Write a protein that binds this ligand. Structure first.
Ligand SMILES: Nc1ccc(S(=O)(=O)N2CCN(c3ncc(C(O)(C(F)(F)F)C(F)(F)F)cc3-c3cccnc3)CC2)cn1
Ligand SMILES: O=P(O)(O)OC[C@@H](O)[C@@H](O)[C@H](O)[C@@H](O)CO
Length: 585
């Protein structure tokens, strides 16, 4: 029947009370789940939110129990990290025609970028040709843009991979997809396996292979699950690798920008730093080298969230300025400005927020005086600005821009990273009464740029800005339980999430939910057979452009009413959220 082909794989809604015993819950991949810690995220205050998201982030480093899934510290995972380090070593020894590609969509793509930079720096500072590069769904401009739509083509992913791998003789393709989900990566990984004389595919993500995505990809015949399952078979013979520790669900369900992005850094920095630092020692990388780095990254979470009350504040101030109708600027130097841009840009798709709402700036990439003459002008009593720099940066360029901004705002706060017993120029740096001073022990670093110190700092900042940005929006009443209900359906995955959110919140059948969602999307056109049988891309292309699609469909189901009636109901409510909450009653 029409639709059947497209919706066959969707599990039916369970009868109430049997969500567990139906085996529905067991079919939800770890990455897609509701985190139980955050069931009441919507109710928590800023200080609680920082606690709950810190707890959620800590789960990355939690160990395996005694019938269960491998984690970051499990032996099978560190073993794989070791073997991959080795394969990376082979390439570093023979850099003529070698290349290392890091590839993902969205934040996996953004993370790919940073790490390609860092490791390209590392080899530069040793007078080696840079062997790293990146790939992001939608080309290089995707790095600083909200472009959720571009990850759904496998032929695209393969094309971008053919370009960059030229007439190289030996390529390592690290495909990053947190959910083991992105058609962009799946095609890349599959092509790799079809030419193993040249390619070594290494898949990174945070679900068991058995929970890998399995609905059809429009321009490709295999599914992510098939591709991954076949990569796991090749791992015996050491010609593919799958690096897939569980780290537990995201605090905002499906928000893989957060733990997934962090885990991607932790996991990949760790393993690549090990590979480099141990080739010129003439020693194989060993579990023990990896562990040193991981434990350090794990200290970094403790250090970072020991500043929790100061973090909670910056949240409250960021939230205040958006409650009014202000704007928020995240001004940061080098690498950490980038992290800043990336957080701000991610607020657009994640929260359906305007590019002005949380903006990032690097010293998007503006000069000292340029920021001074351009952006400075429209700052205002209500806004918040954030300064993110180390004490190693060039604090004269810093002190200026804050001196100036002080006069227009007064809601400044800052984020400063320091080696132990560095001091903060200007003893009346007040300026910042209540700095977020994050201060780092001395570690023994032998590489010129102190990369471990860099990585730690990036991560700690990421953690702060993610918690700040995410918490700010929750506080504004925009998150339902721990779900972003009102998301813009901008790719198939979000489409599948919308449908799931309707089954879960409504409790009604799969057919009904599907009908209400498709009616909501294509309103005012009615459901025809063509529309039922259409490929998910056609629904995505049309939903991408509307507002409140999911809430409209949810009300049509709760009220057992038409779209015409549910739009009218919503318009005559004080807000979207109250319309939804009161109707969920
Ligand atoms: N490994 C992956 C990744 C993505 C996908 S997906 O794009 O096809 N889609 C992802 C999200 N997804 C779900 N999203 C949300 C839910 C919820 O129930 C939960 F509470 F768990 F978050 C929600 F309440 F939000 F709806 C469930 C799923 C889900 C449901 C059943 C099977 N698989 C995923 C459906 C599958 C499938 N497999
Ligand atoms: O790495 P995945 O599971 O393939 O996810 C890829 C992207 O969709 C993901 O990074 C998304 O853009 C983020 O907004 C999620 O917070």
């Amino acid at each position: 029947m029409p639709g059947t082909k497209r919706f066959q794989h969707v599990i039916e809604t369970p009868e109430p009370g049997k969500w567990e015993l139906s085996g529905y819950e067991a079919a939800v991949p770890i990455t897609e789940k509701s985190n139980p810690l955050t069931q009441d995220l919507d109710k928590a205050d800023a200080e609680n939110i920082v606690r709950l998201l810190g707890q959620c982030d800590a789960e990355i480093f939690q160990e395996e129990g005694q019938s269960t899934y491998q984690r970051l510290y499990s032996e099978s995972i560190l073993t794989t990290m070791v073997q991959v380090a080795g394969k990376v070593q082979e390439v570093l020894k023979e850099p003529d025609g070698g290349l290392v590609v890091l590839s993902g969509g969205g934040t996996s793509g953004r993370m790919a970028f940073l790490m390609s930079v860092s490791f390209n720096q590392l080899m530069k500072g040793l007078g080696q040709k840079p062997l790293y590069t990146y790939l992001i769904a939608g080309g290089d401009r995707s790095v600083v843009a909200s472009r959720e739509g571009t990850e759904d083509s496998a032929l695209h992913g393969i094309e971008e991979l053919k370009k960059v791998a030229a007439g190289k003789k030996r390529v390592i393709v690290i495909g990053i997809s947190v959910g083991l989900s992105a058609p962009f990566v799946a095609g890349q990984m599959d092509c790799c396996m079809n030419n193993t004389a040249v390619f070594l595919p290494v898949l990174v993500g945070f679900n068991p292979v058995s929970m890998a995505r399995n609905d059809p990809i429009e321009d490709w015949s295999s599914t992510f699950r098939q591709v991954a399952e076949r990569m796991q078979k090749m791992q015996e013979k050491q010609k593919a690798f799958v690096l897939n520790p569980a780290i537990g669900p995201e605090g905002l369900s499906g928000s893989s920008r957060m733990k997934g992005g962090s885990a991607t850094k932790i996991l990949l920095e760790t393993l690549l730093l090990a590979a480099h630092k141990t080739v010129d020692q003439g020693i194989a990388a060993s579990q023990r080298c990896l562990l040193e780095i991981l434990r350090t990254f794990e200290r970094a979470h403790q250090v970072t969230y020991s500043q929790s009350p100061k973090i909670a504040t910056l949240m409250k101030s960021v939230s205040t300025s958006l409650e009014k109708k202000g704007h928020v600027y995240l001004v940061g130097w080098q690498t950490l400005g980038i992290i800043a841009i990336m957080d701000g840009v991610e607020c657009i798709h994640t929260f359906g927020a305007d590019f002005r709402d949380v903006r990032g700036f690097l010293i998007f990439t503006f000069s000292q005086e340029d920021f001074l003459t351009s952006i400075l002008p429209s700052l205002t009593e209500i806004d918040t600005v954030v300064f993110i720099f180390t004490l190693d940066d060039n604090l004269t360029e810093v002190q200026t821009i804050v001196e100036q901004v002080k006069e227009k705002t007064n809601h400044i706060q800052a984020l400063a990273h320091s080696t132990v017993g560095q001091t903060l120029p200007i003893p009346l740096k007040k300026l910042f009464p209540s700095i977020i001073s994050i201060t780092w022990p001395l570690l023994f670093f032998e590489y010129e740029g102190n990369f471990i110190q860099k990585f730690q700092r990036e991560l700690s900042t990421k953690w702060v800005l993610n918690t700040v940005s995410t918490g700010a929006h929750v506080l504004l009443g925009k998150i339902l339980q721990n779900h972003m209900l009102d998301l813009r359906i901008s790719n198939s995955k979000l489409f599948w999430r919308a449908l799931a959110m309707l089954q879960r919140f409504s409790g009604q059948s799969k057919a009904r939910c599907i009908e209400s969602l498709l009616r909501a999307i294509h309103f005012p056109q009615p459901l025809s057979d063509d529309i039922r049988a259409a490929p998910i891309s056609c629904h995505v292309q049309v939903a991408h452009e509307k507002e409140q699609v999911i809430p409209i469909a949810l009300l049509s189901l709760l009220f057992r009413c038409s779209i015409t009636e549910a739009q009218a109901h919503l318009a005559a409510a004080p807000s979207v959220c109250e319309a939804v909450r009161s109707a969920l009653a």
